[PDB]
Write a protein that holds these residues in place. Sequence first.
Motif, short mmCIF file in Angstrom:
data_model
loop_
_atom_site.label_atom_id
_atom_site.label_comp_id
_atom_site.label_asym_id
_atom_site.label_seq_id
_atom_site.Cartn_x
_atom_site.Cartn_y
_atom_site.Cartn_z
N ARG A 17 -11.11 -5.36 -3.49
CA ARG A 17 -10.49 -6.67 -3.34
C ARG A 17 -9.64 -6.97 -4.54
O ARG A 17 -9.94 -6.52 -5.65
N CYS A 18 -8.60 -7.76 -4.37
CA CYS A 18 -7.93 -8.23 -5.57
C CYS A 18 -8.72 -9.35 -6.29
O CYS A 18 -9.15 -10.33 -5.69
N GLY A 19 -8.91 -9.21 -7.58
CA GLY A 19 -9.51 -10.29 -8.31
C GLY A 19 -8.57 -11.30 -8.94
O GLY A 19 -8.96 -12.36 -9.27
N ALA A 20 -7.33 -10.97 -9.09
CA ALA A 20 -6.33 -11.92 -9.56
C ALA A 20 -6.14 -12.99 -8.52
O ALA A 20 -5.99 -14.15 -8.83
N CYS A 21 -6.19 -12.58 -7.27
CA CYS A 21 -5.89 -13.46 -6.15
C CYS A 21 -7.04 -14.45 -6.04
O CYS A 21 -8.17 -14.03 -6.05
N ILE A 22 -6.79 -15.75 -6.08
CA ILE A 22 -7.90 -16.71 -5.88
C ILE A 22 -8.70 -16.50 -4.63
O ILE A 22 -9.92 -16.58 -4.71
N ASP A 34 0.31 -1.00 -3.33
CA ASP A 34 1.60 -1.67 -3.11
C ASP A 34 1.50 -3.05 -3.69
O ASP A 34 2.49 -3.61 -4.07
N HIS A 35 0.30 -3.63 -3.74
CA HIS A 35 0.20 -5.01 -4.22
C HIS A 35 0.17 -5.05 -5.75
O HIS A 35 0.89 -5.84 -6.34
N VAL A 36 -0.63 -4.19 -6.38
CA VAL A 36 -0.81 -4.31 -7.82
C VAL A 36 0.34 -3.74 -8.60
O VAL A 36 0.73 -4.31 -9.61
N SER A 40 2.10 -9.07 -10.94
CA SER A 40 1.33 -9.26 -12.14
C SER A 40 -0.19 -9.20 -11.89
O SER A 40 -0.98 -9.61 -12.75
N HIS A 41 -0.58 -8.72 -10.72
CA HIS A 41 -1.98 -8.74 -10.34
C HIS A 41 -2.76 -7.46 -10.65
O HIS A 41 -2.80 -6.53 -9.86
N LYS A 42 -3.38 -7.37 -11.80
CA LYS A 42 -3.82 -6.06 -12.15
C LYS A 42 -5.35 -5.87 -12.08
O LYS A 42 -5.83 -4.85 -12.51
ZN LIG Z 1 -3.58 -10.28 -5.81
#
Ligand SMILES: [Zn+2]
Length: 597
Positions: A17-22, A34-36, A40-42
């Motif tokens: 899962r992305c953790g940057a994303c709320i 493709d997302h990271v 800026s979502h690392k």
């Molecule tokens: Zn994200």
Amino acid sequence: NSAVGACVLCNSQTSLRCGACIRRPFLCCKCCYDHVISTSHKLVLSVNPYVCNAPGCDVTDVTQLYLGGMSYYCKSHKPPISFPLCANGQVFGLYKNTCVGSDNVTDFNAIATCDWTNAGDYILANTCTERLKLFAAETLKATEETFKLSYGIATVREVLSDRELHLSWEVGKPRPPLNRNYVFTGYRVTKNSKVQIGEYTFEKGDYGDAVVYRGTTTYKLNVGDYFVLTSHTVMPLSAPTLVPQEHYVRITGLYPTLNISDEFSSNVANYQKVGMQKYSTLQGPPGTGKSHFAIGLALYYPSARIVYTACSHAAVDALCEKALKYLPIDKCSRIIPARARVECFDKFKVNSTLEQYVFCTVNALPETTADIVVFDEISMATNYDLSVVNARLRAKHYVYIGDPAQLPAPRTLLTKGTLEPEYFNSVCRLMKTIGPDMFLGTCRRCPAEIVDTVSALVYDNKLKAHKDKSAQCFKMFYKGVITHVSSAINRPQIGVVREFLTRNPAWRKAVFISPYNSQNAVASKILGLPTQTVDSSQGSEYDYVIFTQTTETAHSCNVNRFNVAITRAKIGILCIMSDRDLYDKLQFTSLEIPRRN
Ligand SMILES: [Zn+2]
Ligand SMILES: [Zn+2]
Ligand SMILES: [Zn+2]
């Protein structure tokens, strides 16, 4: 088990899962990368965060971390045998071998990193693919939820009244706009603990830093009591905004009748369609058919379990009116949220359960089946509500009533650019692209004075009228001065109503509306009139009303704002503008300066 799931985008099973994303979305190995890689979502989550496990390290960027047996390290703290968590357009995780990937990442990145303060962000949220709308809707609302934590507390400085207050605001923090879109929880302190006391709305007063207040538990306030803007948890979505449409040749779901009160003879033609479709949209225009129409489907389909909804408590209730008439009070419930916003609305006691007619706000909805579901003022709704409605009620049919030329949901966060009606929610887009299913009009509360004003190239096209021009036209084209509270005042603009049509005798029982808050106030000072703003002016009937613009600022001259000011009158209207090119669509007679005393 909490860590494994469907990619939000391509649907492939994943353990990332992305953790940057709320909203912490699930992302498969391809879509995650493709997302990271280009945002800026690392921060990537699995059962653990992808971070350097080396004690003393602070590397968190998935694009610089290596698998170390079964933990993760930077270049520095990496074991000799170890490979990167990014490689070949994929992030490492379960089901690499299966995952499909997506050509939908340009919008997903955009939606996940914007900040919701721009009209643009809301267009992406309604033009995107359906799944992303659920992602955006959620993202947006948790963003508005946590932004409330940025504002100051209010403390009760003085209890003036039953109804009025003096607040001191906590120093150094911004203070929120005072209005019904903001809802504070109240608080009192013992000498040992802190105890909740109900929810409250606040409004500016005339003289002084005095504020009006409504409350949920009538508990009388102290000095020292304080108010916080409460941020609630936001639940995940699941149902689409709109389900996918089905066309029918017959009438499915339930069984119509041959015993309609003959007053509904004119709506038989649309009750037609509600049988033929999975969901049907109905515009709309004020006054009203809409309030009436919603009822004639009960009688037309007398066995149909029907659920009636809106966002506004007001409108949900207003539809028990026009519905405790025509409909049997006994077999129909009408239910309540966590806390009544002011003073609300309920039915028989001890409870359980509901059947034939249920009346409820989108928030307080239960998990139920219906045959028909009516969503009342969708122009006021957001794709979060659409989703929730669709997720709590399994209907055979969905009628969505509303008119996009009236007022939209408040976007707190939206401070730059402006929303066209099509971008309000999923439904308004339809009504402004493949046109409204079944228009209606009919106008049984307003004179053709203004009925065919709003008909013109001012968002409607062909509307027509029942009543006739039994009123008075109006026009005016000079421009006063402004004193820019934060809201502006145009008292020389209200200066020309003062002593020219005041001459009109008993025709003096009038209401005053005007665009902003502070020129809305100077009606109880000079002149003296019962005043109500545009945001208040919905469903309520009026006679003599007057209108005072400002500079323009097309926020005063928003054509939807303006439609739902002029459609709020029966007897007489008159308008004083700024204009200089706005009269090319308002069809009346011009008047002038030295003939007004
Ligand atoms: Zn994200
Ligand atoms: Zn994917
Ligand atoms: Zn390290």
